Design a protein that fits this description.
Chain A: A motif (MREI motif) lies at residues 1-3. Chain A: This is Tubulin beta-2B chain. The complex is a heterotrimer of chains A (426), B (412) and C (316). By secondary structure, chain A is an alpha/beta fold. Chain A has helices at 11-25, 69-75, 102-106, 108-123, 141-157, 181-191, 203-211, 221-239, 249-256, 286-292, 322-335, 374-388, 395-398, 404-425, and strands spanning 5-8, 62-66, 89-91, 131-136, 162-167, 197-199, 264-268, 309-317, 348-353, 364-370. Chain A has a ten-stranded mixed β-sheet with strand order 3-2-1-4-5-6-7-10-8-9, with helices on both faces. In chain A, helix 1 (11-25) packs across helix 8 (221-239), helix 4 crosses helix 5 and helix 5 runs parallel beside helix 6 (181-191). The longest helix of chain A has 22 residues, at 404-425. Chain A is globular and about 60 Å long. Chain B is globular, with a radius of gyration of 20 Å. Chain B has 412 residues and is α/β, with parallel strands linked by helices. Chain B has 16 helices and ten strands. Chain C has a single domain (2-249, 262-315), classed as Kinesin (3-Layer(aba) Sandwich), CATH 3.40.850. Chain C has 316 residues and is α/β, with parallel strands linked by helices. In chain C, strand 8 and strand 9 form a beta hairpin. The chains are: A alpha/beta (426), B alpha/beta (412), C alpha/beta (316). The interface between A and B is large, with 46 and 51 residues. The complex binds taxol, guanosine-5'-triphosphate, guanosine-5'-diphosphate and magnesium ion (MG).
């Protein structure tokens, strides 16, 4: 099987560097080097993310889409930056304006064809394609607009292969941009209707989880990114490993989406202990479920405790008892019968790889489909209206060839999306 | 004389590698000896690959190892219809190429995991295409039906109410081994909170060895495969008996091993030792095939069983005077060199049809409704060449399996 | 509210010599017994039931509402040789043999003309098919991928759909015929109606009261449903398999929508399909909907007829 990553925008891009920083080491691939793999198993399934050309050069099969040179020229001028074949860099030296409209209708719409071109060169690579990974932020141009287009096109070209989306939904407390809800509401819209698996991460849900669950005092972006990339590795790549009970994107999809919206999840990693001290090793297993299922530790902003779950997928990856795994999951399902929805006898989807995260003994990625994420699109949707009402920075959109009915559309859509999700919380 | 086997679904393959291990182990045929007599099917390469990478690597022909690099999908539909279809031909070909090479066979011991994608769906049509190509044989499918509370897949029931209805009108005798109810045995009758899947497999890998292996092997009271279905199914529904083993004692802890027949047989009817969460909560047995192996005196049996026939609290069906098929083999069991299985010199792999499953099916059917009642993951199948028909019409199916397993018992 | 109506057609010469026996037993005027299990619906029409009697019970009230400015929807469902063509169109120009559509169109133009005193009428027609999840205009072959959009009040509408002005009953029939020639169907040897897509015919009755200055716009949706396909049987592959999945998905969506409306649910899943979103405004609120299900009484069709019957049960 296979997949083809997609680094839309700067963020989605910045993260690319971290997702590939990791994944590679979790596959023994040095900058341009080959497979130094401490083992021999980190190779029989690599294909999922690379391509065979030389014999020591397995190149990441991702796409780097962005209308701001400097960015990709920071990712390509640093560490692992020199492993992507230049063909991968689909830049847009234009003005990468922070407008969803500027990267979806006017500026991005041009650079698109020169992207799809490659997304096809990579898809028609070899063997059988599974789906595409998509990273980006719903709070900017090259991210929400142009990346949200990249998919609307992808999903027309292969409505068969899957589409996981890793979105950095606009954090609450403080917005790292101003129109944010504009660029956001507009991209979520496109998401709820193309990709079929979305993993929403919040820069501040991370800080928290990174400053209190990792006594880490100076959580640089690199970190946040790093933590995130840690989860997306547990998801995909991982399951493309052996296991007593293994799954793969689809299983994950076909066990997690009760209703076609596409629904968004909230990823959570397992061993998340501070370096030295904490290295408690309390990782027998009840310790991992202890972790994963708590409020804090959910990369999302919202707290599960604020709304039932529809599905859950503990994708563990480290030798354990299909008994102490299958078992724990249960008590968990009974101690919290309250929030776990009922019309699904077994919400949880236990998954079990074998080999764990390179240096760790036992981990377990968590992919939750809780109704709690209602209280986020609400947020976003609110911010919109409060500012849409006055058409705040709307001239930067319309003036870029947009529509007063376009914004209406998205909000509503994504706004209805909130509605539905409640239809199950009850 | 022989009995091919088709291990379908990652699980059916893991269990397969296991049951297949125990085999050579008690036949003196190391890694590289003769040639198996089965096949391996899965729509997820990485798993069959484990049989291609790990142990018992060269004991198979890359021809009896079928894979569909494509996608597994924990959904019946896709595995049965859409994807699973593409492979079937090829699959069959082997069970027609391997079925020819032999000499007057008896059937195909099928190994699948009820609630999976490749295990539920696929087989559904595999067994399906068999019942027509060899209606004149035995179709005993050895299943690992849904843990009563500890299921895995979110949809599981969708996949198991569907593998039951499609296979029902095609199997001869369906053996059942409950994944969870086996853990209990690993906790209560062996002590270990560290049971790797690789263990449950060693277990069924045992109970199964008692079925084919040793039975198809000479003895003081041989029992052919046909024998089963005949002495084991009272009615055409591909009736599902339950597998049970007796000396499930720990090879470390306790040691009373020397537990004469009189004991190991009584240890079969206590509900805490039956590889199935179908505790005889009321289910009246209606036929049991006590397969013994090792040093056993026929009188010991034709007495140990007599004592049972008169315990009454073990109530057998009405319309059934005597329902005890005593199968005696010679060669004692053969425990893994150093797993965790005691290693006695006699065992009792008793399987049976019990009005008990009236439960297990019930509890699994109900599940289904709850979700179907809201369509839950329905769009995942529809979009895979299925319809409101196949679900609703396979629900009605089992419905008459809840009435069937009710009528054939509870009444006189 | 929604009403489901079952119609059994008489046996044809091609199946008279086949020696099939009547599996269709009737009860009252709402129940049909197949294999000792009952099936209750709003109305069941045997074979003796006229085209006039069928129209009055299923479509007449919807036509009056549309002429009064309200919306209404009529769905027609059935497998091949069930009676869809005969029920919905029949002998298009014959007065007795004519189906449902020529009657709706008859009644509309009988209200029109009869009001020429202060009223100004405009009849606008639209015809599109949903094929491979795409909205294809059947009145303009260039418009193959229309999108569903929302106005300022969140009402979904098909953007850029051809809207043909029609001033007579004959103009409507000619428009239906033109559109039918653009529908995705397969070349099949013996039979009139076999499709691989869902069809939606829109009759918009616009009126302006010149003196009162008040305007009305009632929408009548005529939906032609392709039958559910068991893909295991037929052995559909490639584009045909993509067609079968798309037809099945749409029927599930529709079933989910009518079920929600029947149970009076606060959430109605219109977003499950493009079809349910096109029909959202005409399915919700003050709108009457009739699902006409046609089946055969043959003993051989017992499988596909019980399939048509269970779909009607889903609606309720
Ligand atoms: C001596 C020793 O055991 O060191 C550990 C360590 O101290 C801890 C604290 C690690 C450490 O992680 C962090 O401090 C961290 C920094 C930024 C963002 C997020 C986390 C570690 O850096 C991370 C590193 O993780 C891995 O090696 C995994 O394979 C992981 N790899 C990466 O994230 C990665 C980092 C740099 C370059 C390439 C990859 C991974 C996880 C999931 C999926 C794929 C890969 C580990 C175990 C450790 C160190 C090295 C200190 C922890 O994190 C992970 C992801 O394992 C933080 O809490 C856990 C518990 C670990 O015990
Ligand atoms: N006893 C036993 N049960 C197993 C084993 N492996 C899996 N199972 C059980 O069988 C089911 C898992 O099926 P999967 O592995 O998900 O799927 P599959 O049937 O192999 O086929 P796919 O879904 O297409 O991958 C679960 O109920 C597991 O508990 C095993 O080695 N032994
Ligand atoms: N986690 C994370 N967020 C980022 C990174 N870079 C920008 N962001 C977030 O992305 C939003 C800004 O959008 P930006 O990426 O600049 O848009 P674009 O570059 O015009 O497509 C803010 O909410 C930031 O917090 C990053 O490297 N990691
Ligand atoms: Mg598998």
């Amino acid at each position: 099987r296979e997949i083809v990553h997609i680094q839309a925008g700067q963020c989605g891009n910045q993260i690319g560097a971290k997702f590939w920083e990791v994944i590679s080491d979790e596959h023994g691939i040095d900058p341009t080097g080959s497979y130094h793999g401490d083992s021999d198993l980190q190779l029989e399934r690599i294909n999922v993310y690379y391509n065979e050309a030389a014999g020591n050069k397995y190149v990441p099969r991702a796409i780097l889409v962005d209308l701001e040179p400097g960015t990709m020229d920071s990712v390509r001028s640093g560490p692992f930056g020199q492993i992507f074949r230049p063909d991968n860099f689909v830049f847009g030296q234009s003005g990468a304006g922070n407008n969803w409209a500027k990267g979806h209708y006017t500026e991005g719409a041009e650079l698109v064809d020169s992207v799809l071109d490659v997304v096809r060169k990579e898809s028609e690579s070899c063997d059988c394609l599974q789906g595409f990974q998509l990273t980006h932020s719903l709070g900017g141009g090259t991210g929400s607009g142009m990346g949200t287009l990249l998919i609307s096109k992808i999903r027309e070209e292969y409505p068969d292969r899957i589409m996981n989306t890793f979105s950095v939904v606009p954090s609450p407390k403080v917005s790292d941009t101003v129109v944010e809800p504009y660029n956001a509401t507009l991209s979520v819209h496109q998401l709820v209707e193309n990709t079929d698996e979305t993993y929403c991460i919040d820069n501040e849900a991370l800080y928290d989880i990174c400053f209190r669950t990792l006594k880490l005092t100076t959580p640089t972006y690199g970190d946040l990114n790093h933590l995130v990339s840690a989860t997306m590795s547990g998801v995909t790549t991982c399951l493309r490993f052996p296991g007593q009970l293994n799954a793969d994107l689809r299983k994950l999809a076909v066990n997690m989406v009760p209703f076609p919206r596409l629904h968004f999840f909230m990823p959570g990693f397992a061993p998340l202990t501070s370096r030295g001290s904490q290295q408690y090793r309390a990782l027998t297993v009840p310790e991992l479920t202890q972790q994963m299922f708590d409020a804090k530790n959910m990369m999302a902003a919202c707290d599960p405790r604020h709304g039932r779950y529809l599905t859950v997928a503990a994708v563990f990856r480290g030798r354990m008892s299909m008994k102490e795994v299958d078992e724990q999951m249960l008590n968990v399902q009974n101690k919290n019968s309250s929030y776990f929805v009922e019309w699904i006898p077994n919400n949880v989807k236990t998954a079990v790889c074998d080999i764990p995260p390179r240096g760790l003994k036992m981990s377990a990625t968590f992919i939750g489909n809780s109704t709690a994420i209602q209280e986020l699109f609400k947020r976003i949707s609110e911010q919109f209206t409060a500012m849409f009402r006055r058409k705040a920075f709307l001239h930067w959109y319309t003036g870029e060839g947009m529509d007063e009915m376009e914004f209406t559309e998205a909000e509503s859509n994504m706004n209805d999306l909130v509605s539905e999700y409640q239809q199950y919380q009850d | 004389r022989e009995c091919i086997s088709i291990h379908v679904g990652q699980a059916g393959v893991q269990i397969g590698n296991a049951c297949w291990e125990l085999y050579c182990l008690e036949h003196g045929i190391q890694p590289d000896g003769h040639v198996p007599r089965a096949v391996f099917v899965d729509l997820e390469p990485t798993v069959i690959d484990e049989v291609r990478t790990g142990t018992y690597r060269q004991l198979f022909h890359p021809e009896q190892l079928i894979t569909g690099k494509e996608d597994a999908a924990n959904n019946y539909a896709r595995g049965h219809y859409t994807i699973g279809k593409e492979i079937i031909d090829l699959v069959l070909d082997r069970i027609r190429k391997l079925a020819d090479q032999c000499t007057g066979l008896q059937g195909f011991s099928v190994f699948h995991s009820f609630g999976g994608g490749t295990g539920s769906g696929f087989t559904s049509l595999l067994m399906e295409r068999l019942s027509v190509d060899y209606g004149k044989k035995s179709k005993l499918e050895f299943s690992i039906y849904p843990a009563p509370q500890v299921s895995t897949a979110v949809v599981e029931p969708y996949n198991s109410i569907l593998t039951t209805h499609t296979t029902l009108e095609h199997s001869d005798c369906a053996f059942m081994v409950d994944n969870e109810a086996i853990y209990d045995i690993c906790r209560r009758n062996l002590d270990i909170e560290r049971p790797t899947y690789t263990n449950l497999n060693r277990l069924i890998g045992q109970i199964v060895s008692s079925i084919t292996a040793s039975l198809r092997f000479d003895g003081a009271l041989n029992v052919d495969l046909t024998e089963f279905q005949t002495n084991l199914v009272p009615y055409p529904r591909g009736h599902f008996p339950l597998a049970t083993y007796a000396p499930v004692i720990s090879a470390e802890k306790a040691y009373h091993e020397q537990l004469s027949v009189a004991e190991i047989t009584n240890a079969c009817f206590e509900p805490a030792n039956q590889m199935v969460k179908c505790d005889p909560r009321h289910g009246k047995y209606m036929a049991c095939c006590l397969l013994y192996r090792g040093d056993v005196v026929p009188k010991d049996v034709n007495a140990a069983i007599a004592t049972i026939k008169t315990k009454r609290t073990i109530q057998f069906v009405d319309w059934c005077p005597t329902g005890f098929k005593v199968g005696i083999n010679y060669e004692p069991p053969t425990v893994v060199p150093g797993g965790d299985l005691a290693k006695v010199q006699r065992a009792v792999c008793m399987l049976s049809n019990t009005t008990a499953i009236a439960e297990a099916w019930a509890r699994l059917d109900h599940k289904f409704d709850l979700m179907y009642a809201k369509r839950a993951f329905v769009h995942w199948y529809v979009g895979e060449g299925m319809e409101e028909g196949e679900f609703s019409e396979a629900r009605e199916d089992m419905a008459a399996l809840e009435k069937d397993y009710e009528e054939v018992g509870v009444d006189s | 509210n929604i009403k489901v109506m079952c119609r059994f057609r008489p046996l044809n010469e091609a199946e008279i010599l086949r020696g099939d026996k009547f599996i269709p037993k009737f009860k009252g005027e709402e129940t049909v017994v197949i294999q000792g299990k009952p099936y209750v619906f709003d109305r069941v029409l045997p074979p003796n039931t006229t085209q006039e009697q069928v129209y009055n019970a299923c479509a007449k009230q919807i036509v009056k509402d549309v002429l009064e400015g309200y919306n209404g929807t009529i769905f027609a469902y059935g497998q091949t040789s069930s009676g869809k063509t005969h029920t919905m169109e029949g002998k298009l120009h014959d007065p007795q043999l004519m189906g449902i559509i020529p009657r709706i169109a008859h009644d509309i133009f009988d209200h029109i003309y009869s009001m020429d005193e202060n009223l100004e009428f405009a009849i606008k027609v639209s015809y599109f098919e949903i094929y491979l999840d795409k909205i294809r205009d059947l009145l303009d072959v260039s418009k193959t991928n229309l999108a569903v959009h929302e106005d300022k009040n969140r009402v979904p509408y098909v953007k850029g759909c051809t809207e043909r002005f029609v001033s007579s009953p004959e103009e409507v029939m000619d428009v239906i015929d033109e559109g039918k020639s653009n529908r995705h169907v397969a070349v099949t040897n013996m039979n009139e109606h076999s499709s691989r897509s869902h069809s939606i015919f829109l009759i918009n009755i616009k009126q302006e009261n010149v003196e009162t200055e008040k305007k009305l716009s009632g929408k009548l949706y005529l939906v032609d449903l392709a039958g559910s396909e068991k893909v295991s049987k037929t052995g559909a592959e490639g584009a045909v398999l993509d067609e079968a999945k798309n037809i099945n998905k749409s029927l599930s969506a529709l079933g989910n929508v009518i079920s929600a409306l029947a149970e009076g649910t606060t959430h109605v899943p219109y977003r499950d399909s493009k079809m349910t979103r096109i029909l959202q405004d005409s399915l919700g609120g003050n709108c009457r909907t009739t699902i006409v299900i046609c089946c055969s009484p043959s003993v051989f069709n017992e499988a596909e007829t019980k399939s048509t019957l269970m779909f009607g049960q889903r609606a309720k």
